[PDB]
From Swiss-Prot, chains A, B:
This is Acidic phospholipase A2 5. The active site is at H47, D89. It is found in: Secreted. SMART domains: PA2c (SM00085).
């Protein structure tokens, strides 16, 4: 569930997803569409796509089980569907962390005109 | 800031915004198109519109000052722009609270085809 995603972002990237990644580019935030603007934005695009590939459970709603060790997330294999959700969230959190050097407020609150026809997954 | 919106929702409505309102109707965790599907969805629509009227500060990002006693939210008059953000978030949290009894999973994950109509603010 997206609260768990927030927690993983905090554990892995050392910053809040809701604070910093909720209005970024074309995909980090609600109503994502268009083309990813930078690496951080692509992290969100990939996350959306990852969620779209999860079948048999609800990736935006269902809770998953995981452990965290000093910023290292282990998605538990108690249920392959919810593990898939967890792996989506873990991957996105890692992607935000790995691209922290190009995070840029240039991409905050960008005009509607910047996000039009969507890159397909 | 959206983290503060979460705090207001949690206190006022008694449940998490990120958990329960990230994929509801055409506007809760989505937006940009459609007509509100029920009263909860309309809360989100109105919140989007409210944010749309904010001039001079960034409603998704900027932090506001508020106090809370016995579950009330008093948006501080230290800055009219951030107070306006606060009031938007407060109104939405109240709206979620007031409509919690009709909150229904009927409106989870609705197809894009259900959100093609356009309703102005």
């Amino acid at each position: 569930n997206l609260m768990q995603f927030e927690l993983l972002i905090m554990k892995v990237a050392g910053r809040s997803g809701i604070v910093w990644y909720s209005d970024y580019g074309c995909f980090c935030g609600k109503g994502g569409h268009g083309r990813p603007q930078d690496a951080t934005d692509r992290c969100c695009f990939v996350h959306d796509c990852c969620y779209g590939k999860v079948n048999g459970c609800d990736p935006k709603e269902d809770f998953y089980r995981y452990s965290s060790n000093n910023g290292d997330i282990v998605c538990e294999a108690n249920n392959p569907c919810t593990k898939e959700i967890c792996e989506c969230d873990k991957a996105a959190a890692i992607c935000f962390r790995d691209n922290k050097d190009t995070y840029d407020n240039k991409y905050w609150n960008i005009p509607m005109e910047s996000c039009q026809e969507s890159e397909p997954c």
